[PDB]
């Protein structure tokens, strides 16, 4: 089933997601949603679920869904 | 302090690093060594030190240096 953001909204591939940190943000479009330990291992990430997206500085980020915001579902 | 692999070898940018998982591996050349909180946040990773590399399937991996092997330094 679906993975949800910090506002309970289903996250889809291609959606713009956002997470802030002290000094900046990571914002960009979802490329993949990883939900099993095996898929996480294959994609080189840890602790699913992970939302994989490229941010505004062209950095590939893997982030937990429950602490980001899907801007397209706001 | 330098950044070292699981065999205590200093890792350099460009070195092939390797980590196995059940069903595959992640192997590729180090592109960046992240040691500061500032750079970790900019690159969307946690808990420096991290070594950043693209694996043989074009997955961008961020990994603890001390839990992988620097193949070029064997």
Author numbering:
A (entry chain A), B (entry chain B): 4 to 77
What does the paper say about this structure?
To gain insight into the potential function of HVA1, the structure of the Hva1 protein was solved by X-ray crystallography and refined to highly acceptable accuracy. The three dimensional architecture of each Hva1 monomer was predominantly β-stranded. There were seven β-strands of varying lengths with five forming interdigitating antiparallel hydrogen bonds to create a semi-cylindrical barrel-like twisted β-sheet. In addition, this small protein also contained one unconnected α-helix. The crystal structure further revealed that the protein crystallized in a P1 space group with two Hva1 monomers that are related by a non-crystallographic two-fold symmetry. The monomers are connected by extensive polar and apolar interactions. Although the observed 2-fold association between the two Hva1 monomers may be a crystallographic artifact, the potential for these interacting surfaces to attract ligands and binding partners cannot be completely ruled out. The region corresponding to the monomer-monomer interface of Hva1 was occupied by a bound nicotinamide adenine dinucleotide phosphate (NADP) ligand in DHFR-NADP complex.
The HVA1 gene is predicted to contain 3 exons separated by two introns that encode a 75 amino acid protein. No known protein domains or homologous gene families exist for this gene.
